[PDB]
């Protein structure tokens, strides 16, 4: 019942995209959840337990299609379950939220680094990559891949509606790395000079569809149709595991003011209707790589990560359930 | 020289794409050659001819694509020098120059009507037709369809950077055909719930090539994909002559403030450049038809369109030069 | 008004299927028209022609998909128009009638003879050719072939729901050509031992498609998978002028109980509904020579046949009516 | 040797069809193992073990295609024999074979019923579904998502020679769900039309490849060509140990008179082979999941499924094997 | 007949590939028969009539598959037979022969440099052009497109067995070109960084496709895969009139010696069969373009060069015959 | 060091492929790491371990491509390595040494021979079999086979420049294997007729690709295109442990003198660059199985047959090193 307010702030900033990526709302809600057991006035394990479950349920209840998210609050919510349902006092159940919290949010940015570490050997000297949206594990490896001396120069699409290339491209340009910026339109006219394609995930599937970015599909499409590599860099927290029994992964549609501003749409009649998938998934035939903290896999192994690290738990019900 | 107030007037709203549209641009620049003609005040054939010489260069050099503009000016100039070389005098070769553009204004305009009642019947009823940029002869298609009261609901892209299917939806809404607008980037992802894609031309080239708005390339590879009929509406007048003897047709790169704001651009690193072609190239593999208003062609069949059209011409110089 | 009874029986008989084929149905409707001139009571031009128009209308109103037969009644219709319009008198209309109908009856007859020396000079000895369906345009091609001395084998599928292939097996075997017998799901399974695939052709559309017996794109489609060359056997009338000016061609769906007999069928519930298209569309680029009299073409230059021999006509309304 | 009524009757019921599918053959194939331990008259452990070794040579040699019939044999006989060279008397050994037999019936009764649940979150409201065959596993799937109100067609081929689309239609129709029944040739035709394929499985092997009823390749192939799912519905024991080494799977070639009746081949001439395979080969790119009872897959994690489940039995013989 | 010694040395040349290229040996065979007719020593015009008939057969005799070297002589042929049928008397028929075969040696010629001139035109400055054997049509290309400026490399495939590569890599450097030289093996491996391709044509047929060199089909192939522009120069006398009624181009398969010299050959086994097949077959979906002295054409108009400038001649016999 | 001679006689007799395939290599290194300890004249256990870390180094520095090798001289090393750790002394150390040279040198000859037994099954009888270069892993498949009584054909490309396919002529046709000898241009030419594709592998990677002789990938596609198998026969030693972290393989460049001889080379002008890549990367899409004495695997595999073997190692630096 008696909820922090910065559970709700986060929970207001993840919705509205002040707080955007898949693995920056991950990190964000388990900070979250870290908060909410520190600053509790509980005095119950019972109390405390009670105020996880709902944190983590208003934190579920903000974007859907990532799962990152979704996988943050389990990180967390399964060790204190484990440890509630194991008897711990008020104080053990704390440092088990707080503690775990911590783990998944230094896990996710060593896991960050090292992807970058090895995505970044497979650019060679002179490349020319294109990428989409803005995604830090794409980054990581276009960044780390100049400070080894490849002179590399990146095509940053803009990235329509929310223009998250704005972001990509001022970012790699403060690293030196030089940046051609494009209308999402043009990918097919530059792949012919284009030599990898490297992007990001939001949500990855146990058959090895790729979850990401409204447009990452049609990349991929024309990359392969070009023999352009298209890797994909993500998190083993971006593999999506109620998708091994079947489960589809929802489409987040977002609001249509993004697309045409308030002021503009309000003019237009009632028989246009404006719509905003927020995502679309590339099929694994157009994924050569995807590159994880544990390293390069095909797309088909996706399952192979799904089994070895998330099975487990899909005949247990979600970690924060009553 | 003394040119026309509307030689110029016209030639600038050319460049600044206030007239745009590959057949608009094409009747305009005819209009044109049809007004200084008008308000000539020479008073010798060779005064006139020199005259309207010049005003067709000037129109040729404002946007070098859309070979409609100068098939448009050959279609007047052809004539004109025709009349001057055999003997006309001033009161013939003035009428010459109006009429000649008379005749291909009201056969541009005669052209799209008859391409939308021939394209219309590869629509059926129920159909949901995906469209990209603003064009004219598509809408043709579009419009007619509808018209015949099958009922049909448009895609529409909104066609970055310069935002063309903003006019293209509410021009459908405001005929009553119901329209979705989509990002350019969501073409693939709702390609499976299209069941026709109708698109126009700028230049179609002798080998079946299609060079249309940026994206139109996107669109129709991924339609193949899916078995998507992609329908290509083009006057004959879009069949580039030149292409025949080898031409790479020159793909307009405008300005990088249609893309990122003047405001804005300012502000950003030196080592981002912004790239803008106005056009891509779709090849031939990627579409089912090209419309003209002479009938259905598959595309292959753009060599014959001009072989029987065109071919004459090219043994000669332009007829504007020295 | 006054109506022999053979042209009502040819009706009775196409629409049934009794008889069957694209070629043999507009032969057999060139004849109807034959008859009804030869025994004609008629005193009138005025009311022969009257009699041919009804006639006509009766012959097109039997089935929709095959061109044929429309080419059929157009060849003798045009010529008997251009008499009565030019003022000839009740005999000279006649023999008109009568000497078309023989004229295409016997070009029908030599351009399936001519179709087989052509297209049998791309059967090589030891030449494995799956067929589907019974034409005799494909089978002219086969038996020529074996005529030749090249030890053919002809792999037959059974073709549902009315079973033409027992026809085509029969009819190979009786020349001595051995023959492999299938169900039409096993042309894939049997695709990898095929050398050369023939079969025929109900309408050809301007851009190329080939609208033949229900199943033809999917052995087409296989084929081509494999690199079998898909060769299609068909007449100059097989052609279809209206698709060049748009239309789409009406796939004839044909009665329920020809695939579940009506016995069988009664006593199924009324939320099954069996659907029996008797014919499907093969794009193009699967397939790589249409076989005519005229020559070999590639599947694009369909509109070329369509063009020189066919054009003409489509800015008059329909040679029977009114 | 001293073999049960119920072994040879069941061996002769796979082998004419009368009992059919590859789930029911399999739990046939245990039902007669357990009648032949309960009714056996045995006296002695080894004489016993030589009646089970027996009875099921004779199960093994009915139907080749199906591994889930000799998956269904090494389950009972793998347990049966461990017991009986660790030294079991007859009472150990028959109820070890008895109830081995009922665990792998309970097993694969429960494997369907899961195997729907988990394949009905891949089907969404609206969805028209093209299956092929009768498929028990494919047909839960649909059951499933029927029962939980998605609003479903299923598309039903006949499945020529022998018919089982009459099953799939009636029994379909009978839980309530729409059917759209076809020959197998409609395929391609109505695939644009199609949403979803769900199709059954009698061997999968290792590299990823479903053996399934002939004319199952065609309809993967077609799917793929217009981006439709291809969902394989199969059983964990569906999946071929042998492969793992390199075994091609046998093809059955049933006899001539399923396709062209007795009564009607006898007339035909001795240069028709009638050919009636009864499966296909459809390749992993064709496939896009492979859902089992432990959750989806990728067809390429084929291999793990049996290196898990298969793998430790291929250094020995068979468990019936001298 | 008395056939002068320059006819059996011509012969004896292009059967060695002394004299090679399809141009070049259709120009040495026009230069016999003119040399046949200059040192004739016929005294009437029957005599003469018979030397070019035999002189012309002993030419056609040496190598099948080029039907550059055919056309050649009809060009002469079907001029000398117009004029003997006509009754032309002696020095008529000579001078007939004579500039028959200069004015086909001269457009020959004129064919090439325009060839260069048409195909330079979509060569671009900093392209990587891959070839294959020595074409000088493709040559032409290369040659003007570095004449005019453009900075160009190509990468010349060796060509086995003849070696042909060696030939191209001399004759570009020689005009200071740069030149990359590679086994035919490594074509794929460097596609990746070609640009375009460029390639020559012993026969063209009716539905697009090209005979040329052994191994051109597979650079083709992988140019296709990784969207590189395969263009085929080729001179209208390459496009073969035979197969516009079905005719198969023969394949030539010379000595196996020339892939293992007799030496080595002699020693190795029996059981080892070398073949040495001169050309193959690439199929028209994989050239984007023709390039002939009249135009670009897509692969697919081959017809229409074949059909309006050879066409005629199919329903005659060859004019070397009686 | 005391560095033996028979070390540096197999470094230089791999650099000059006087010894090559990439098994035979990997023998060797360990052979001579055998030679080394067998001979060594080191008194302390520190001074033999410093001779074989430098005759490691030595091996590894000699050909970069095939992996093979390392992954020899890991399998002595890593145990020689753990034998000094633990603290073995002198004769300790030294048989560690000898053993796992020769642990290996008997595993590899097993593993060929059972790649045999597990491809031959894959062999049906009638087949033709394309291969590339010489393998021992896929000539073990094919001679397998023929010894079953499968009567086979295997087309041989004779792999330039090195002419590798002459010895796997003269191989397979001494154990009475008929053989087809084709230049590497005619692989797509003879596709059509061959049932099969068998090679071998320098290295996989962690996705599926396999690095084979250069053209290796051009027959992997047509094959592709052509729906023919594609089956690489390779040992567990072949897959390239690195490859999970990102790492590329070098593609090694070969003296250009094995392409132009030098009498001839040298003759060449400078701007002619000959270039000698030794091999090409094939990727898994066009690759069926591999098949390792392990059994059958899609490429998609690898990465396990590398997780489950090598992964451990990753963490740990290169055995030889200090
Ligand atoms: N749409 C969708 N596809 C998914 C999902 N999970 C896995 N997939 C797989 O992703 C692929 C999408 O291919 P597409 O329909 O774009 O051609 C399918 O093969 C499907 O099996 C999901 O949640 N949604
Ligand atoms: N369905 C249909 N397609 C036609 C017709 N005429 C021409 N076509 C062409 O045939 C092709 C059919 O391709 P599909 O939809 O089978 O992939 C299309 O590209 C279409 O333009 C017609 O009457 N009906
Ligand atoms: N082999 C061969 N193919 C020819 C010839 N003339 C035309 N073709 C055409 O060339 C193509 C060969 O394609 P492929 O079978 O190599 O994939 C087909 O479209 C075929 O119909 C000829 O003389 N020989
Ligand atoms: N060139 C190269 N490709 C590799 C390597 N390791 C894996 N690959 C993979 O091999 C494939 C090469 O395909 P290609 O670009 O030839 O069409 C890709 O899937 C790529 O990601 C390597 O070391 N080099
Ligand atoms: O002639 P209509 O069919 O109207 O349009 C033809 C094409 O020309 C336009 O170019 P722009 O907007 O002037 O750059 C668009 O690309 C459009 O599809
Ligand atoms: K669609
Ligand atoms: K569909």
Redesign the interface.
Known sequence: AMIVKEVYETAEKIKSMEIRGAGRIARAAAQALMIQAEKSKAKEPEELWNELKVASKILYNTRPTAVSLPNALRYVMHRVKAAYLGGADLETLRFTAINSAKEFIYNSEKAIERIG??????I?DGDIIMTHCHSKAAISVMKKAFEQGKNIKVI?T????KWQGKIT??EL??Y???????????????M?MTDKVVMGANSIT???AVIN???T??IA??AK???VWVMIAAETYKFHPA??????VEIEMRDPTE??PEEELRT??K???????AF??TP??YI??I?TER????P?????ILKEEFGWALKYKEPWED
Chains 1, 2, 3, 4, 5, 6 share one sequence.
């Open positions: 570490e090895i995505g970044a050997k497979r060679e940053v803009e990235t329509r509606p491209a001022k340009a403060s030196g790395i030089p940046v051609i910026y494009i209308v999402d339109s043009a990918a097919r006219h530059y012919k146990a058959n090895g970015k409204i447009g599909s049609l499409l024309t149709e070009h023999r998708t091994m029994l079947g489960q589809l697309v045409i237009w009649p028989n246009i209707e404006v719509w905003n998938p679309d998934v694994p035939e050569d790589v590159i390293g390069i896999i095909p088909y192994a996706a399952i192979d």
